[PDB]
Design a protein around this nucleic acid. Structure first.
Ligand SMILES: [Mg+2]
Ligand SMILES: [Mg+2]
Ligand SMILES: [Zn+2]
Lengths: 127, 78, 98, 60, 155, 24, 117
RNA sequence: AACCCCCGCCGUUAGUUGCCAGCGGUUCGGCCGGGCACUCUAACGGGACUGCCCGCGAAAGCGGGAGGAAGGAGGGGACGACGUCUGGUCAGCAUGGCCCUUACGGCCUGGGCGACACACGUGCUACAAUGCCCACUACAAAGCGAUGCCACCCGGCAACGGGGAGCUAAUCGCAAAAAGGUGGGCCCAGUUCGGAUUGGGGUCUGCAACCCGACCCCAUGAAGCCGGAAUCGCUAGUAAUCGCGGAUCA
């Protein structure tokens, strides 16, 4: 019945409980268009829905926690992907080449000692 | 700031009380530049130390709310 | 009903003592929730290497203080004697309460 | 004044604002961690030796 | 690097129109890592475009960046111990880079108060054939044909 | 102004609260 | 209108207008409006004649201000001067009262940099 | 190089963290029952080996692609050889020699490392409309706390004080992450930009805040409208930028 998938990025997890229906999307309560306001990445998270050709035909319910505001969006992005692919093996043959199934290894690194920001070193000098 | 009970040393008040108890001189080599000047103590001369020596700084009406250190140099040429 | 705390450093020694209790309590009494690991509180200490001036190449350690929880329900007399005699702790300061 | 000072640090005759921290091992005046009660120097020395329980090499 | 050429950074295509060139422009506008801010600021001008002229902001953007695309430029180079101002064709990427860049600066040059209106008016003059960024382009191309003598060292 | 001794982020940078910054 | 005796903060926010008044600032500006029921948004260019004398006379007679305030500031300094407290001698040479970094900057009171070397 | 630690894909093991994902009740707070699937909490193991397909080659290897969470060391850490610099440190400590011994040792009060006509280094805060103020609203991680972290209530404009619950603490607490987001004021001004300097009054620590602490509220509102010669940082979650914690310690 339902389409589940796990979302995660920058320690921002996001459960994805999808249920075929209309288009009403709830995430941690509230509404999708309600929670994300004035952000273009919002409609970008629904990209997997536009790839499958079924924008308005599914009621979503995501539980995203931790991480930043945007990290949640990327979490929902990959989360929705695993949800729709869970009940669709052929949709992986067109969601994968488009690049979706990846935790995005890109993550902040440790601020190294002696330095200031893991890389930026204090102004070199000799005077 | 010490708003609850103005700060000051006991031997300061003690030594200065006998000075008012009969109206003696004023000579008094102190070592507590941290204390606050007592009001009725006007007209006396506290020899305040400052690492170097005892400064014969006089006293009056205006100089009261301030410390004893306020009127005693701790550095040369100042 | 009863709850046991198993604080300690080395998780290798903590795993042996924790698993030991699990076998002893279950194999000789009612139900017992397995070893429940908690967020390990760590004391990260950073510091300089050289004695004099060297605000770089500094070295730092960390104090691993592990935590493991185990809950026994029905107070069995067999489990009380088992844990009272058959025990092999060491660097594992345990604390138990009702 | 090194010896007489390490003794004065444990004295605490007058007010508490003189019972400053003082390393036990090599008796350092500063860089004294309260937890270990040692200085940063003698701290690392022991750590390498393994005389510091639970104190493993930090790496992440 | 001395070894590899280092491949370009394939950026994410536009999230509203569907075009990488647009998003790249947002990045140039992006101050202190505020994409969503710069994005809106860009789309603000897009609406200002339709306010003035009934033209789509999409092609209005292409026309501008196209007319500010430097065809050639002079580059310094040593020869035995002397620098020659040798002109020659630019790389398509760099042309796109400079174009998008100059426009952003040309907007800053304007007296306009709000950033959007600055980007708005600038995109108009750019698409037209005469603007702050455009003239800076015309300037560079002059240097090329000017030093055309030293163009013998094409390298 | 991260330096204004009388603003929002004014006390925030100074790790304090006071009047202009809400406090319990 | 000539509010504080001579000062005339015309054509602008009423609250800000009082900020230009010596001895009056952002805080004391809001206080006058909350004690006379004046909207901070409205300009001085369009106010009632009653409100003029109203707000003007209020702040005027209420607390100290203007040069007479500035006279008190120097007055206390005459007191730190007549004897010479550590605070006063700093005003003598122009040094800061906080005993800050004189070995470096502190140009705010020491004036421009007199290189000379 | 490779074995060990952190972050990435997944599983096994343990379910008082979280969970109407499933159902019912519900003062609708996962609160009750209930459940371990999920998230997570750590613990063990798996996976990536130019392994597979195609081109080049004698080989090693290189190049393009599929599978895959991740390809040609995946990102990061720890690891810094023989030697080098008469490099640093007798003031961490050890230590040969040297020198003093009613003082080159020891205790105390006060002063002093904070002294300023000047110059250099590393920094912080700005010069503002991609911006500044007010009100309202939302998403972190990591770490720390029983004579310590203080929920929350009363008071004061305020720092903060009086009362007082929880907490040897994934269960209580510092705690509001900030930037962002919504609506509003500002209209280019030495400015609601900028916050140095200075006057008056207050709170906390501490025997004790003149020298010489910190933070409040009122006023004061200086230079600077992006900086000469020259010069520094970093190739991706990096630069820039915006926050929180910890050691230290009254
Ligand atoms: Mg798992
Ligand atoms: Mg006043
Ligand atoms: Zn020591």
């Amino acid at each position: 019945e339902q389409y589940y998938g796990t979302g995660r990025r920058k320690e921002a997890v996001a459960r994805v409980f999808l249920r075929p229906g209309n288009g009403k999307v709830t995430v941690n309560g509230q509404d999708f268009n309600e929670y994300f306001q004035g952000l273009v990445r919002a409609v970008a998270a629904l990209e997997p829905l536009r790839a499958v050709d079924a924008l308005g035909r599914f009621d979503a319910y995501i539980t995203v926690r931790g991480g930043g505001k945007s990290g949640q969006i990327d979490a929902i992005k990959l989360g929705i992907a695993r949800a729709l692919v869970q009940y669709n093996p052929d949709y992986r043959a067109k969601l994968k080449p488009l690049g979706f199934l990846t935790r995005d290894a890109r993550v902040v690194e440790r601020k190294k000692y002696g330095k200031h920001k893991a890389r930026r070193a204090p102004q070199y000098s000799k005077r | 700031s010490l708003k609850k009970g103005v700060f000051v040393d006991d031997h300061l008040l003690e030594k200065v009380l006998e000075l008012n108890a009969k109206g003696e001189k004023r000579l008094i080599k102190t070592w507590s530049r941290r204390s606050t000047i007592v009001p009725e103590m006007v007209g006396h001369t506290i020899a305040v130390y400052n690492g170097k020596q005892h400064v014969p700084v006089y006293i009056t009406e205006n100089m009261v709310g301030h410390k004893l250190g306020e009127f005693a140099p701790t550095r040369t040429y100042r | 009903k009863i709850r046991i705390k198993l604080r300690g450093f080395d998780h290798k020694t903590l795993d042996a003592s924790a698993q030991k209790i699990v076998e002893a309590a279950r194999r000789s009494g009612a139900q017992v929730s397995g070893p429940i690991p908690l967020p390990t509180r760590v004391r990260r200490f950073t510091v300089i290497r050289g004695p004099f001036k060297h605000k770089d190449s500094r070295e730092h350690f960390e104090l691993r203080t592990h935590n493991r929880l185990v809950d026994i329900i029905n107070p069995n007399r067999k489990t009380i004697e088992q844990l009272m005699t058959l025990d092999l702790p060491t660097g594992v300061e345990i604390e138990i309460k009702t | 004044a090194r010896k007489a000072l390490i003794e004065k640090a444990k004295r605490t005759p007058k007010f508490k604002v003189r019972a400053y921290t003082r390393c036990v091992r090599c008796g350092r005046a500063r860089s004294v961690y309260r937890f270990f009660g040692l200085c940063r120097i003698c701290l690392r020395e022991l750590a390498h030796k393994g005389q510091l329980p639970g104190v493993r090499k930090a790496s992440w | 690097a001395r070894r590899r050429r280092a491949e370009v950074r394939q950026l994410q295509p536009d999230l509203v129109y569907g075009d990488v060139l647009v998003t790249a422009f947002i990045n140039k506008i992006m101050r202190d890592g505020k994409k969503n801010l710069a994005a809106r600021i860009f789309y603000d001008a897009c609406k200002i475009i339709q306010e003035k002229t009934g033209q789509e902001p999409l092609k209005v953007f292409k026309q501008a960046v196209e007319n500010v695309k430097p065809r050639m430029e002079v580059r310094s180079r040593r020869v035995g111990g002397a620098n020659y101002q040798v002109p020659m064709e630019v790389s398509p990427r760099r042309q796109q880079s400079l174009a998008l860049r100059w426009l952003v600066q040309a907007a800053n040059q304007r007296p306009e108060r709000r950033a959007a209106v600055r980007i708005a008016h600038e995109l108009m003059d750019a698409a037209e054939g005469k603007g702050g960024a455009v003239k800076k382009k015309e300037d560079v191309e002059r240097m090329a044909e000017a030093n055309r003598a030293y163009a013998h060292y094409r390298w | 102004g991260k330096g204004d001794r009388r603003t929002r982020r004014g006390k925030i940078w100074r790790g304090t609260y006071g009047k202009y910054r809400p406090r319990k | 209108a000539r509010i504080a005796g001579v000062e005339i903060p015309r054509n602008k926010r009423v609250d800000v207008a009082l900020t230009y008044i010596y001895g009056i600032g952002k805080a004391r500006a809001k206080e006058a409006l909350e004690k006379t029921g004046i909207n901070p948004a409205t300009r001085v260019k369009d106010l009632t004649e009653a409100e003029v004398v109203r707000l003007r006379e209020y702040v005027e007679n209420t607390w100290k201000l203007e040069g007479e305030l500035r006279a008190e500031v120097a007055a206390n300094i005459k007191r730190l001067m007549d004897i010479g407290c550590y605070r006063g001698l700093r005003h003598r040479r122009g040094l800061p009262v906080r005993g800050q970094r004189t070995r470096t900057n502190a140009r705010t009171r020491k004036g421009p940099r007199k290189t000379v070397a």
